[PDB]
Every structure is written in structure tokens, then in C-alpha cells.
Amino acid sequence: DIIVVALYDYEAIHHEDLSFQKGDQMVVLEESGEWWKARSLATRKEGYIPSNYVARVDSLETEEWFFKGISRKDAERQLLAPGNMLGSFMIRDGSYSLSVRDYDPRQGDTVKHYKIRTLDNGGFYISPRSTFSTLQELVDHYKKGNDGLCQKLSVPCMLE
Amino acid sequence: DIIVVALYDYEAIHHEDLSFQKGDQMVVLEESGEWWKARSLATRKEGYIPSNYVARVDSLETEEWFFKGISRKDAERQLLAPGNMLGSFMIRDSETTKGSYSLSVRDYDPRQGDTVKHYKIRTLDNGGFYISPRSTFSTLQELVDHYKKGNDGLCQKLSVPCM
Amino acid sequence: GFPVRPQVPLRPMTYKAALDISHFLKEKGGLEGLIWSQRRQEILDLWIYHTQGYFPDWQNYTPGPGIRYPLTFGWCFKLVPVEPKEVLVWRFDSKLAFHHMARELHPEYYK
Amino acid sequence: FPVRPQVPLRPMTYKAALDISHFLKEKGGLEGLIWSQRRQEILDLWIYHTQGYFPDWQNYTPGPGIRYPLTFGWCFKLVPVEPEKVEEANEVLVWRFDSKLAFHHMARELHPEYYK
């Protein structure tokens, strides 16, 4: 049984669709096309759902850029290991931090740390100049250009 | 000068924003955050623009063969229209998944007459693209160039872009 | 709540979908009795596209003058002139679920 | 040709609310439409999608009677409906544009406790 969880609320209008609230778990029944047939675990109600509104429960926190529960000190050490490049990075932890490998011709290799804050509405930001609805969008943004960070993000920190 | 081109229409409501239509070219004046300050090359009007609505000239999304956000059905319709020929093609992506691409090709056979075949363009671990594992490419343009040289398993050799 | 629910995947308009959206919007607080405008229709169509995935090229009507009938069988709203260009009001008509008026008036639209 | 997608997030401001106000006051816009929760949510989604403002800015003072916008710069209030045809001598709300709201923060004068 493939279990997914809702990331957003969805209100069904079509009588064959399935309504759900963020956090609801569902079993995927049919997975053809981008509209999946699913059943709610709580209620047993079935219907079609937008596939981009859910994530596999076993996929949670497996993002390549995410480094679960590790300290600031450990993040620096790992990022500073040879094999990592300019702009190598980590997101680490509701409260998140971005750690980025930097270079300066005088100081050499360093790691900069940025607090990722959240607004009351839940949006993520490092700077008041841009806000993101998800951490993934934040990562994708700073991979496009430094936009105020020490470096443009390149690739996730190498695992050891 | 960073020249970008609009991928969609945008209607400004804010007096400091800049309206544009698909195809308009603009110069980026300040590239801060996600709302960039730009100038229309056509009207010299200036204002803020949503940065995801534009792309650098000569970049992927501005390739003549690339059709941003065109669906499978619309792809078939456009390719079957007159003007197009055997092997006419497009690479399209979806609004709902990033990095997912498709190849649509104008085909002909005595069974079905004029048809359009669609191929899934998959992404590798390294970020390479491929339709079949034997031929992988750095970039979509390299994929396009390859299948222009020979069909290599496709229904047809790629000829020219749609429309 | 948050984040705002995003664009859902595209899917084609059908009789069944148009009928369900019709009955949804006929309920108090919806579309019934509102004066039509291009801007209001576009706002509605964007909302349907964003939240339900139907591309916004389905809500067309027969030309004036007089009552404008929906071209999409299953869409049960018509635009009715306010008698005083014409001022038009969205009106739900349950009979449109079974009677494709637009096709009867303009069969040439459906070749 | 594809529908213009979600634009990037940005915070609601007085300036933005004022311009959206004037945009929607034109005929065929918001002016004079009967209020409902569904209609307001549809509007807020459209604004969010096309302009990038998170949809929690369009709040109004509690009834009964005229409801004033909490967000300074938003120049619509909700007022008791009246007929077009004036009756001779002898709660349903509509959106109503009011230019003076650009300069007078009515909601805060009425409910200072909402603000801090």
C-alpha cells in the first residue's frame, strides 16, 4: 500500500473527486495520469486527487539538500571537507538554517550560515527581498543566482 | 545588458509594475529577489516584472523548438495543422512538474494517416537527458541535434520546429 | 490555509465536469444573478483552471442579441439580458443539462 | 497557448492595495457586486495567482452595518445594498469603492485594538 500525505487542502467539485485537508493520509489506488484515484485513510472515501498536492509518506525529509538534525559545527566540518565545491550547501533544522560553502582569496574556505525565517502566513525567507512558499522553491531560487548570499548554491554537501 | 523575453502575457496593476506580452523583449535593470526591474525595448517603459515569466535570450525556453507549457492535446493540434511537415516537432514541459519534458513528432503511416507521436524525455542522476538509455545528452539541444541526424528508434527523423 | 493550494494538473472539460461545476456555482453566494462582464468571467475561469485544472476555453456562449446559450453541453448557465450593448446576467437553467440549446440554434458550430 | 502561471510572492502594501482598488472600481469590476465568502475567496485567489499577494489581507470590520477594510489602502467597504431605482416619498452587502479610504483609516479609528 502506497501511502501519501496531503501538502495542501483540496475541495472536490466533481462528484468523482476526493476532498482532503493538509495532513490527511491517503492510499493511492490508481496512478495513471496526473490525477490519481485515492482513498482516505480516515474516512475510507475514494475519489480522484491532484497528484502534485501529495507526497509519499516514506519520501518525507529525504530531500538531497536536507540534513536532518545536525549542528552548526557539524555542518561546517562536513561542508569544509575536500570534495565539496564553491556553493556546496545544506538545509538543516519548523526552524531551518542554510549553510553555504564560501571562498575568499585571503581567508580561504569558509562556511556561511543563514537563518531561514517564516512569516505568520508560513512563507519562508532569508531576506525581506524574496519569500517562498516551500523550502524547495527557496533552494531553486538561490541555485539560480546568489541574490545576496555569499555564493550561488551549487550542489548539496557530500555525504561521508 | 541582460536581455530577456517574455514567455507569457503579464498585466500590471501596480503602477510600479510593467505590463508585457508573450514575445516582448526587455532589459533587466535590477535583478533583486524575484520581482526584477526591467525596461521594455519596444516602449522604453520601466517597471517590476515577475522573473519566472521571462527567460534569457538564446536560452532553453527561448529555443524555437521549445514550447513552454503546451499540453499533449494542444501539441497534437498544432502539429497536425497545415504548414508543418513530416518530422515536425516540439519539446514541451508541464506547469505542474519541474524538469519534466516531452517530445512530440509529426508522423505518417498508411494505417492511421497523419499522426503525432509523443516521447517521454527522462532525466538521469547526473542531470543528463535521454529518451532511450543508449543515447544520453548534456542538454536538450544536444538531444534535438541527435535526432535531427537520424530517427534512432523514433517514428521519424526530426525535421523542423512546429509552427 | 497555508501555503495556498497551487495549480492542479490539466484535465479536459467534459459534460460531467461542466454539470457538477454548474450545480456548485448555482448555490447561494455563487454565480447566480451576477451581472456578466469580461473581467468577471476571466476571474472565474482562472479560479476554475487554478483549483480544478480545466483550461479556460469552455465557457463560451451564443452571440447576441437575446439570451446567450452555453456552447459547452453540461454548462447550465445562460446569459439573460436585463431589458432596460446589452446588460447580461448569469442565470442557472436546469433544463440545459438535457437540452443543448446552442447546438439547436447554431449547428454550424459543431461540425 | 498556456495560462500565465503563479507569480512570485510579495507582501501586501498600502501602495499595492490602493492600485488594486482603483483597478477593480472600473465598471464590470468589483464595484457593486454582492458580497459572499465564496466570491471574496475567488477574488483573493485571482489576486494571489496573478499578482503574488498572499490572500489574508482582505479583512473587514465586524457587522452590523458598514464594514470597513482593515488593510489601509484597500478602498472598498461593504455596505448595505440599495436599489438602483430610487423609491419616491410616501444582511445583504455590496462592495463599494470609496476614494476617501485612501486617506482615512476608518477601521483603525473604529477598532484601534486590532492594530499594534
Side-chain angles (χ1 to χ4, degrees), chain B residues 34-44 46-63 65-66:
Chain B
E34 300 197 283
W35 285 89
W36 292 351
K37 178 96 177 265
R39 178 193 305 120
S40 165
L41 281 181
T43 66
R44 289 197 177 177
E46 300 185 0
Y48 294 93
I49 61 166
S51 62
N52 62 316
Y53 274 43
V54 302
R56 245 88 159 164
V57 283
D58 303 323
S59 69
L60 171 68
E61 300 165 283
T62 79
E63 292 292 345
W65 41 263
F66 187 77

PDB file of all heavy atoms in Angstrom, chain B residues 34-66, unseen atoms left out:
ATOM      1  N   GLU B  34      12.801  38.224  -6.729  1.00  0.00           N
ATOM      2  CA  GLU B  34      12.055  37.576  -7.777  1.00  0.00           C
ATOM      3  C   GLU B  34      11.221  38.539  -8.635  1.00  0.00           C
ATOM      4  O   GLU B  34      10.702  38.159  -9.620  1.00  0.00           O
ATOM      5  CB  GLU B  34      11.142  36.496  -7.214  1.00  0.00           C
ATOM      6  CG  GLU B  34      11.846  35.387  -6.477  1.00  0.00           C
ATOM      7  CD  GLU B  34      10.966  34.185  -6.308  1.00  0.00           C
ATOM      8  OE1 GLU B  34      10.126  34.240  -5.452  1.00  0.00           O
ATOM      9  OE2 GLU B  34      11.113  33.249  -7.079  1.00  0.00           O
ATOM     10  N   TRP B  35      11.132  39.779  -8.209  1.00  0.00           N
ATOM     11  CA  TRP B  35      10.478  40.797  -8.966  1.00  0.00           C
ATOM     12  C   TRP B  35      11.546  41.771  -9.460  1.00  0.00           C
ATOM     13  O   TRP B  35      12.004  42.580  -8.732  1.00  0.00           O
ATOM     14  CB  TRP B  35       9.448  41.504  -8.127  1.00  0.00           C
ATOM     15  CG  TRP B  35       8.222  40.721  -7.900  1.00  0.00           C
ATOM     16  CD1 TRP B  35       7.969  39.862  -6.905  1.00  0.00           C
ATOM     17  CD2 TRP B  35       7.074  40.734  -8.709  1.00  0.00           C
ATOM     18  NE1 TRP B  35       6.749  39.337  -7.031  1.00  0.00           N
ATOM     19  CE2 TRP B  35       6.166  39.849  -8.150  1.00  0.00           C
ATOM     20  CE3 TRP B  35       6.720  41.412  -9.852  1.00  0.00           C
ATOM     21  CZ2 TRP B  35       4.940  39.635  -8.698  1.00  0.00           C
ATOM     22  CZ3 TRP B  35       5.514  41.195 -10.375  1.00  0.00           C
ATOM     23  CH2 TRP B  35       4.632  40.322  -9.797  1.00  0.00           C
ATOM     24  N   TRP B  36      11.912  41.616 -10.704  1.00  0.00           N
ATOM     25  CA  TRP B  36      13.015  42.307 -11.299  1.00  0.00           C
ATOM     26  C   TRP B  36      12.623  43.641 -11.940  1.00  0.00           C
ATOM     27  O   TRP B  36      11.584  43.737 -12.462  1.00  0.00           O
ATOM     28  CB  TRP B  36      13.607  41.413 -12.356  1.00  0.00           C
ATOM     29  CG  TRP B  36      14.281  40.182 -11.899  1.00  0.00           C
ATOM     30  CD1 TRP B  36      14.572  39.831 -10.641  1.00  0.00           C
ATOM     31  CD2 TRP B  36      14.769  39.137 -12.723  1.00  0.00           C
ATOM     32  NE1 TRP B  36      15.216  38.637 -10.611  1.00  0.00           N
ATOM     33  CE2 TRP B  36      15.340  38.177 -11.884  1.00  0.00           C
ATOM     34  CE3 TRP B  36      14.777  38.916 -14.087  1.00  0.00           C
ATOM     35  CZ2 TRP B  36      15.911  37.029 -12.377  1.00  0.00           C
ATOM     36  CZ3 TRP B  36      15.326  37.813 -14.558  1.00  0.00           C
ATOM     37  CH2 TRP B  36      15.896  36.870 -13.722  1.00  0.00           C
ATOM     38  N   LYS B  37      13.479  44.637 -11.893  1.00  0.00           N
ATOM     39  CA  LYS B  37      13.174  45.894 -12.521  1.00  0.00           C
ATOM     40  C   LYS B  37      13.659  45.781 -13.935  1.00  0.00           C
ATOM     41  O   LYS B  37      14.757  45.382 -14.168  1.00  0.00           O
ATOM     42  CB  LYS B  37      13.846  47.045 -11.807  1.00  0.00           C
ATOM     43  CG  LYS B  37      13.605  48.392 -12.443  1.00  0.00           C
ATOM     44  CD  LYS B  37      12.472  49.111 -11.770  1.00  0.00           C
ATOM     45  CE  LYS B  37      12.235  50.497 -12.337  1.00  0.00           C
ATOM     46  NZ  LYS B  37      12.932  51.528 -11.540  1.00  0.00           N
ATOM     47  N   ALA B  38      12.809  46.092 -14.885  1.00  0.00           N
ATOM     48  CA  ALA B  38      13.120  45.901 -16.297  1.00  0.00           C
ATOM     49  C   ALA B  38      12.650  47.060 -17.167  1.00  0.00           C
ATOM     50  O   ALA B  38      11.834  47.875 -16.746  1.00  0.00           O
ATOM     51  CB  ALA B  38      12.507  44.598 -16.791  1.00  0.00           C
ATOM     52  N   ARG B  39      13.175  47.122 -18.386  1.00  0.00           N
ATOM     53  CA  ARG B  39      12.731  48.113 -19.359  1.00  0.00           C
ATOM     54  C   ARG B  39      12.327  47.432 -20.656  1.00  0.00           C
ATOM     55  O   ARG B  39      13.063  46.600 -21.183  1.00  0.00           O
ATOM     56  CB  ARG B  39      13.827  49.145 -19.641  1.00  0.00           C
ATOM     57  CG  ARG B  39      13.421  50.182 -20.688  1.00  0.00           C
ATOM     58  CD  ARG B  39      14.607  50.995 -21.176  1.00  0.00           C
ATOM     59  NE  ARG B  39      15.317  51.632 -20.074  1.00  0.00           N
ATOM     60  CZ  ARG B  39      16.595  51.418 -19.784  1.00  0.00           C
ATOM     61  NH1 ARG B  39      17.316  50.585 -20.525  1.00  0.00           N
ATOM     62  NH2 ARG B  39      17.154  52.040 -18.756  1.00  0.00           N
ATOM     63  N   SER B  40      11.153  47.779 -21.166  1.00  0.00           N
ATOM     64  CA  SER B  40      10.715  47.273 -22.458  1.00  0.00           C
ATOM     65  C   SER B  40      11.568  47.870 -23.571  1.00  0.00           C
ATOM     66  O   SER B  40      11.723  49.081 -23.652  1.00  0.00           O
ATOM     67  CB  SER B  40       9.237  47.601 -22.692  1.00  0.00           C
ATOM     68  OG  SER B  40       8.893  47.432 -24.056  1.00  0.00           O
ATOM     69  N   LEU B  41      12.126  47.028 -24.429  1.00  0.00           N
ATOM     70  CA  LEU B  41      12.900  47.533 -25.558  1.00  0.00           C
ATOM     71  C   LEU B  41      12.012  48.247 -26.571  1.00  0.00           C
ATOM     72  O   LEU B  41      12.466  49.139 -27.283  1.00  0.00           O
ATOM     73  CB  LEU B  41      13.665  46.397 -26.239  1.00  0.00           C
ATOM     74  CG  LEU B  41      14.943  45.984 -25.509  1.00  0.00           C
ATOM     75  CD1 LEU B  41      15.658  44.872 -26.249  1.00  0.00           C
ATOM     76  CD2 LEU B  41      15.846  47.195 -25.368  1.00  0.00           C
ATOM     77  N   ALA B  42      10.745  47.855 -26.624  1.00  0.00           N
ATOM     78  CA  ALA B  42       9.817  48.417 -27.602  1.00  0.00           C
ATOM     79  C   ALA B  42       9.264  49.780 -27.179  1.00  0.00           C
ATOM     80  O   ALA B  42       9.172  50.697 -27.998  1.00  0.00           O
ATOM     81  CB  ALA B  42       8.672  47.443 -27.854  1.00  0.00           C
ATOM     82  N   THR B  43       8.895  49.917 -25.908  1.00  0.00           N
ATOM     83  CA  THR B  43       8.234  51.139 -25.447  1.00  0.00           C
ATOM     84  C   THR B  43       9.075  51.997 -24.505  1.00  0.00           C
ATOM     85  O   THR B  43       8.698  53.131 -24.205  1.00  0.00           O
ATOM     86  CB  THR B  43       6.926  50.814 -24.718  1.00  0.00           C
ATOM     87  OG1 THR B  43       7.227  50.109 -23.507  1.00  0.00           O
ATOM     88  CG2 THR B  43       6.027  49.965 -25.599  1.00  0.00           C
ATOM     89  N   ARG B  44      10.187  51.431 -24.038  1.00  0.00           N
ATOM     90  CA  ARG B  44      11.086  52.061 -23.069  1.00  0.00           C
ATOM     91  C   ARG B  44      10.398  52.376 -21.742  1.00  0.00           C
ATOM     92  O   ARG B  44      10.933  53.107 -20.915  1.00  0.00           O
ATOM     93  CB  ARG B  44      11.721  53.323 -23.662  1.00  0.00           C
ATOM     94  CG  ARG B  44      12.746  53.012 -24.740  1.00  0.00           C
ATOM     95  CD  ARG B  44      13.651  54.200 -25.026  1.00  0.00           C
ATOM     96  NE  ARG B  44      14.673  53.881 -26.020  1.00  0.00           N
ATOM     97  CZ  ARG B  44      15.550  54.760 -26.496  1.00  0.00           C
ATOM     98  NH1 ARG B  44      15.533  56.014 -26.067  1.00  0.00           N
ATOM     99  NH2 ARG B  44      16.445  54.385 -27.400  1.00  0.00           N
ATOM    100  N   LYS B  45       9.218  51.795 -21.531  1.00  0.00           N
ATOM    101  CA  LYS B  45       8.560  51.879 -20.232  1.00  0.00           C
ATOM    102  C   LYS B  45       9.341  51.002 -19.257  1.00  0.00           C
ATOM    103  O   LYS B  45       9.884  49.975 -19.653  1.00  0.00           O
ATOM    104  CB  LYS B  45       7.101  51.418 -20.310  1.00  0.00           C
ATOM    105  CG  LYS B  45       6.223  52.225 -21.261  1.00  0.00           C
ATOM    106  CD  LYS B  45       6.153  53.688 -20.860  1.00  0.00           C
ATOM    107  N   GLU B  46       9.394  51.400 -17.992  1.00  0.00           N
ATOM    108  CA  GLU B  46      10.153  50.655 -16.992  1.00  0.00           C
ATOM    109  C   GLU B  46       9.267  50.232 -15.834  1.00  0.00           C
ATOM    110  O   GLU B  46       8.288  50.902 -15.522  1.00  0.00           O
ATOM    111  CB  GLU B  46      11.326  51.492 -16.464  1.00  0.00           C
ATOM    112  CG  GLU B  46      12.323  51.921 -17.533  1.00  0.00           C
ATOM    113  CD  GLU B  46      13.530  52.652 -16.957  1.00  0.00           C
ATOM    114  OE1 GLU B  46      13.595  52.822 -15.720  1.00  0.00           O
ATOM    115  OE2 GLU B  46      14.416  53.051 -17.744  1.00  0.00           O
ATOM    116  N   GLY B  47       9.612  49.119 -15.192  1.00  0.00           N
ATOM    117  CA  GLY B  47       8.868  48.668 -14.030  1.00  0.00           C
ATOM    118  C   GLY B  47       9.226  47.262 -13.591  1.00  0.00           C
ATOM    119  O   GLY B  47      10.063  46.597 -14.200  1.00  0.00           O
ATOM    120  N   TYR B  48       8.589  46.802 -12.522  1.00  0.00           N
ATOM    121  CA  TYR B  48       8.883  45.472 -11.991  1.00  0.00           C
ATOM    122  C   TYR B  48       8.126  44.379 -12.733  1.00  0.00           C
ATOM    123  O   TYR B  48       6.978  44.573 -13.148  1.00  0.00           O
ATOM    124  CB  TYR B  48       8.555  45.408 -10.503  1.00  0.00           C
ATOM    125  CG  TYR B  48       9.456  46.296  -9.678  1.00  0.00           C
ATOM    126  CD1 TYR B  48       9.084  47.593  -9.364  1.00  0.00           C
ATOM    127  CD2 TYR B  48      10.689  45.841  -9.233  1.00  0.00           C
ATOM    128  CE1 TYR B  48       9.912  48.416  -8.620  1.00  0.00           C
ATOM    129  CE2 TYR B  48      11.529  46.658  -8.489  1.00  0.00           C
ATOM    130  CZ  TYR B  48      11.132  47.941  -8.186  1.00  0.00           C
ATOM    131  OH  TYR B  48      11.954  48.754  -7.446  1.00  0.00           O
ATOM    132  N   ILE B  49       8.777  43.227 -12.879  1.00  0.00           N
ATOM    133  CA  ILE B  49       8.219  42.092 -13.604  1.00  0.00           C
ATOM    134  C   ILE B  49       8.421  40.798 -12.816  1.00  0.00           C
ATOM    135  O   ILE B  49       9.395  40.667 -12.081  1.00  0.00           O
ATOM    136  CB  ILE B  49       8.866  41.940 -15.001  1.00  0.00           C
ATOM    137  CG1 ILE B  49      10.369  41.694 -14.872  1.00  0.00           C
ATOM    138  CG2 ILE B  49       8.593  43.175 -15.865  1.00  0.00           C
ATOM    139  CD1 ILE B  49      11.030  41.207 -16.149  1.00  0.00           C
ATOM    140  N   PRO B  50       7.499  39.835 -12.970  1.00  0.00           N
ATOM    141  CA  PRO B  50       7.678  38.531 -12.329  1.00  0.00           C
ATOM    142  C   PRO B  50       8.755  37.741 -13.071  1.00  0.00           C
ATOM    143  O   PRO B  50       8.611  37.462 -14.259  1.00  0.00           O
ATOM    144  CB  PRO B  50       6.295  37.877 -12.459  1.00  0.00           C
ATOM    145  CG  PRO B  50       5.719  38.478 -13.690  1.00  0.00           C
ATOM    146  CD  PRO B  50       6.241  39.910 -13.735  1.00  0.00           C
ATOM    147  N   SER B  51       9.831  37.396 -12.381  1.00  0.00           N
ATOM    148  CA  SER B  51      11.013  36.879 -13.068  1.00  0.00           C
ATOM    149  C   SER B  51      10.784  35.502 -13.696  1.00  0.00           C
ATOM    150  O   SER B  51      11.484  35.126 -14.638  1.00  0.00           O
ATOM    151  CB  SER B  51      12.207  36.828 -12.110  1.00  0.00           C
ATOM    152  OG  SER B  51      11.977  35.951 -11.026  1.00  0.00           O
ATOM    153  N   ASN B  52       9.805  34.756 -13.193  1.00  0.00           N
ATOM    154  CA  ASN B  52       9.537  33.437 -13.765  1.00  0.00           C
ATOM    155  C   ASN B  52       8.765  33.552 -15.081  1.00  0.00           C
ATOM    156  O   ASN B  52       8.529  32.553 -15.745  1.00  0.00           O
ATOM    157  CB  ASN B  52       8.778  32.533 -12.769  1.00  0.00           C
ATOM    158  CG  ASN B  52       7.404  33.081 -12.391  1.00  0.00           C
ATOM    159  OD1 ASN B  52       7.253  34.269 -12.128  1.00  0.00           O
ATOM    160  ND2 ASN B  52       6.399  32.207 -12.359  1.00  0.00           N
ATOM    161  N   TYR B  53       8.384  34.771 -15.463  1.00  0.00           N
ATOM    162  CA  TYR B  53       7.659  34.977 -16.726  1.00  0.00           C
ATOM    163  C   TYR B  53       8.595  35.237 -17.902  1.00  0.00           C
ATOM    164  O   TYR B  53       8.142  35.373 -19.039  1.00  0.00           O
ATOM    165  CB  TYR B  53       6.686  36.151 -16.621  1.00  0.00           C
ATOM    166  CG  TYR B  53       5.315  35.830 -16.064  1.00  0.00           C
ATOM    167  CD1 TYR B  53       5.165  34.998 -14.965  1.00  0.00           C
ATOM    168  CD2 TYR B  53       4.177  36.412 -16.610  1.00  0.00           C
ATOM    169  CE1 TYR B  53       3.925  34.733 -14.438  1.00  0.00           C
ATOM    170  CE2 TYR B  53       2.936  36.154 -16.094  1.00  0.00           C
ATOM    171  CZ  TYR B  53       2.811  35.314 -15.010  1.00  0.00           C
ATOM    172  OH  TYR B  53       1.572  35.058 -14.483  1.00  0.00           O
ATOM    173  N   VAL B  54       9.883  35.313 -17.656  1.00  0.00           N
ATOM    174  CA  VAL B  54      10.834  35.635 -18.714  1.00  0.00           C
ATOM    175  C   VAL B  54      12.012  34.687 -18.753  1.00  0.00           C
ATOM    176  O   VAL B  54      12.271  34.005 -17.816  1.00  0.00           O
ATOM    177  CB  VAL B  54      11.397  37.044 -18.565  1.00  0.00           C
ATOM    178  CG1 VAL B  54      10.300  38.058 -18.577  1.00  0.00           C
ATOM    179  CG2 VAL B  54      12.222  37.163 -17.308  1.00  0.00           C
ATOM    180  N   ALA B  55      12.745  34.700 -19.867  1.00  0.00           N
ATOM    181  CA  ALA B  55      13.949  33.924 -19.974  1.00  0.00           C
ATOM    182  C   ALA B  55      14.988  34.662 -20.801  1.00  0.00           C
ATOM    183  O   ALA B  55      14.657  35.389 -21.661  1.00  0.00           O
ATOM    184  CB  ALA B  55      13.653  32.591 -20.571  1.00  0.00           C
ATOM    185  N   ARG B  56      16.239  34.438 -20.488  1.00  0.00           N
ATOM    186  CA  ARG B  56      17.349  34.992 -21.241  1.00  0.00           C
ATOM    187  C   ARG B  56      17.250  34.663 -22.700  1.00  0.00           C
ATOM    188  O   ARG B  56      16.872  33.601 -23.072  1.00  0.00           O
ATOM    189  CB  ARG B  56      18.625  34.398 -20.724  1.00  0.00           C
ATOM    190  CG  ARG B  56      19.561  35.351 -20.079  1.00  0.00           C
ATOM    191  CD  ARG B  56      19.203  35.456 -18.644  1.00  0.00           C
ATOM    192  NE  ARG B  56      20.290  35.948 -17.833  1.00  0.00           N
ATOM    193  CZ  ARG B  56      20.097  36.414 -16.607  1.00  0.00           C
ATOM    194  NH1 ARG B  56      18.863  36.453 -16.111  1.00  0.00           N
ATOM    195  NH2 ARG B  56      21.099  36.861 -15.882  1.00  0.00           N
ATOM    196  N   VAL B  57      17.600  35.618 -23.543  1.00  0.00           N
ATOM    197  CA  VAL B  57      17.607  35.317 -24.965  1.00  0.00           C
ATOM    198  C   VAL B  57      18.644  34.234 -25.233  1.00  0.00           C
ATOM    199  O   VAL B  57      19.652  34.159 -24.533  1.00  0.00           O
ATOM    200  CB  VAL B  57      17.911  36.561 -25.814  1.00  0.00           C
ATOM    201  CG1 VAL B  57      16.678  37.440 -25.914  1.00  0.00           C
ATOM    202  CG2 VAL B  57      19.085  37.332 -25.226  1.00  0.00           C
ATOM    203  N   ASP B  58      18.363  33.390 -26.223  1.00  0.00           N
ATOM    204  CA  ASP B  58      19.226  32.268 -26.610  1.00  0.00           C
ATOM    205  C   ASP B  58      19.292  31.150 -25.564  1.00  0.00           C
ATOM    206  O   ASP B  58      20.083  30.219 -25.704  1.00  0.00           O
ATOM    207  CB  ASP B  58      20.646  32.757 -26.922  1.00  0.00           C
ATOM    208  CG  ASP B  58      20.672  33.820 -28.001  1.00  0.00           C
ATOM    209  OD1 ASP B  58      19.872  33.717 -28.955  1.00  0.00           O
ATOM    210  OD2 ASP B  58      21.491  34.758 -27.893  1.00  0.00           O
ATOM    211  N   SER B  59      18.462  31.230 -24.526  1.00  0.00           N
ATOM    212  CA  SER B  59      18.396  30.163 -23.529  1.00  0.00           C
ATOM    213  C   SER B  59      17.397  29.093 -23.955  1.00  0.00           C
ATOM    214  O   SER B  59      16.729  29.237 -24.979  1.00  0.00           O
ATOM    215  CB  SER B  59      18.013  30.713 -22.154  1.00  0.00           C
ATOM    216  OG  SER B  59      16.669  31.163 -22.145  1.00  0.00           O
ATOM    217  N   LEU B  60      17.294  28.033 -23.155  1.00  0.00           N
ATOM    218  CA  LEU B  60      16.453  26.880 -23.476  1.00  0.00           C
ATOM    219  C   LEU B  60      15.009  27.240 -23.811  1.00  0.00           C
ATOM    220  O   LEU B  60      14.494  26.865 -24.864  1.00  0.00           O
ATOM    221  CB  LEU B  60      16.458  25.885 -22.314  1.00  0.00           C
ATOM    222  CG  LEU B  60      15.445  24.741 -22.442  1.00  0.00           C
ATOM    223  CD1 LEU B  60      15.826  23.811 -23.586  1.00  0.00           C
ATOM    224  CD2 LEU B  60      15.321  23.973 -21.134  1.00  0.00           C
ATOM    225  N   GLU B  61      14.363  27.972 -22.910  1.00  0.00           N
ATOM    226  CA  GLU B  61      12.943  28.281 -23.047  1.00  0.00           C
ATOM    227  C   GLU B  61      12.657  29.214 -24.219  1.00  0.00           C
ATOM    228  O   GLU B  61      11.502  29.409 -24.598  1.00  0.00           O
ATOM    229  CB  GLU B  61      12.415  28.890 -21.749  1.00  0.00           C
ATOM    230  CG  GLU B  61      12.560  27.971 -20.544  1.00  0.00           C
ATOM    231  CD  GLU B  61      12.378  28.701 -19.229  1.00  0.00           C
ATOM    232  OE1 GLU B  61      13.321  29.404 -18.806  1.00  0.00           O
ATOM    233  OE2 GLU B  61      11.294  28.576 -18.620  1.00  0.00           O
ATOM    234  N   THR B  62      13.709  29.784 -24.796  1.00  0.00           N
ATOM    235  CA  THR B  62      13.559  30.664 -25.950  1.00  0.00           C
ATOM    236  C   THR B  62      13.965  29.969 -27.249  1.00  0.00           C
ATOM    237  O   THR B  62      13.971  30.587 -28.312  1.00  0.00           O
ATOM    238  CB  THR B  62      14.393  31.940 -25.788  1.00  0.00           C
ATOM    239  OG1 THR B  62      15.765  31.663 -26.100  1.00  0.00           O
ATOM    240  CG2 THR B  62      14.297  32.434 -24.365  1.00  0.00           C
ATOM    241  N   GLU B  63      14.310  28.688 -27.160  1.00  0.00           N
ATOM    242  CA  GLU B  63      14.618  27.912 -28.357  1.00  0.00           C
ATOM    243  C   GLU B  63      13.375  27.795 -29.230  1.00  0.00           C
ATOM    244  O   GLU B  63      12.263  27.643 -28.722  1.00  0.00           O
ATOM    245  CB  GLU B  63      15.148  26.522 -27.995  1.00  0.00           C
ATOM    246  CG  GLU B  63      16.523  26.525 -27.340  1.00  0.00           C
ATOM    247  CD  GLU B  63      17.631  26.951 -28.288  1.00  0.00           C
ATOM    248  OE1 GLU B  63      17.401  26.964 -29.516  1.00  0.00           O
ATOM    249  OE2 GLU B  63      18.739  27.270 -27.802  1.00  0.00           O
ATOM    250  N   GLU B  64      13.570  27.870 -30.543  1.00  0.00           N
ATOM    251  CA  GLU B  64      12.463  27.858 -31.492  1.00  0.00           C
ATOM    252  C   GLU B  64      11.634  26.577 -31.398  1.00  0.00           C
ATOM    253  O   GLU B  64      10.439  26.582 -31.696  1.00  0.00           O
ATOM    254  CB  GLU B  64      12.991  28.040 -32.918  1.00  0.00           C
ATOM    255  CG  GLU B  64      11.936  28.468 -33.926  1.00  0.00           C
ATOM    256  N   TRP B  65      12.261  25.492 -30.969  1.00  0.00           N
ATOM    257  CA  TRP B  65      11.573  24.221 -30.855  1.00  0.00           C
ATOM    258  C   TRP B  65      10.906  23.983 -29.501  1.00  0.00           C
ATOM    259  O   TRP B  65      10.212  23.018 -29.325  1.00  0.00           O
ATOM    260  CB  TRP B  65      12.510  23.062 -31.175  1.00  0.00           C
ATOM    261  CG  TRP B  65      13.841  23.200 -30.623  1.00  0.00           C
ATOM    262  CD1 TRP B  65      14.924  23.656 -31.242  1.00  0.00           C
ATOM    263  CD2 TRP B  65      14.238  22.872 -29.316  1.00  0.00           C
ATOM    264  NE1 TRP B  65      15.982  23.651 -30.419  1.00  0.00           N
ATOM    265  CE2 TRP B  65      15.589  23.158 -29.217  1.00  0.00           C
ATOM    266  CE3 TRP B  65      13.579  22.352 -28.214  1.00  0.00           C
ATOM    267  CZ2 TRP B  65      16.295  22.964 -28.065  1.00  0.00           C
ATOM    268  CZ3 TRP B  65      14.273  22.150 -27.092  1.00  0.00           C
ATOM    269  CH2 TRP B  65      15.609  22.464 -27.005  1.00  0.00           C
ATOM    270  N   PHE B  66      11.137  24.868 -28.555  1.00  0.00           N
ATOM    271  CA  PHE B  66      10.636  24.674 -27.230  1.00  0.00           C
ATOM    272  C   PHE B  66       9.346  25.419 -27.031  1.00  0.00           C
ATOM    273  O   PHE B  66       9.270  26.589 -27.300  1.00  0.00           O
ATOM    274  CB  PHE B  66      11.646  25.152 -26.233  1.00  0.00           C
ATOM    275  CG  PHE B  66      11.273  24.840 -24.833  1.00  0.00           C
ATOM    276  CD1 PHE B  66      11.426  23.582 -24.334  1.00  0.00           C
ATOM    277  CD2 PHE B  66      10.722  25.803 -24.022  1.00  0.00           C
ATOM    278  CE1 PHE B  66      11.068  23.286 -23.047  1.00  0.00           C
ATOM    279  CE2 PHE B  66      10.368  25.510 -22.744  1.00  0.00           C
ATOM    280  CZ  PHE B  66      10.546  24.260 -22.251  1.00  0.00           C
TER     281      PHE B  66
END
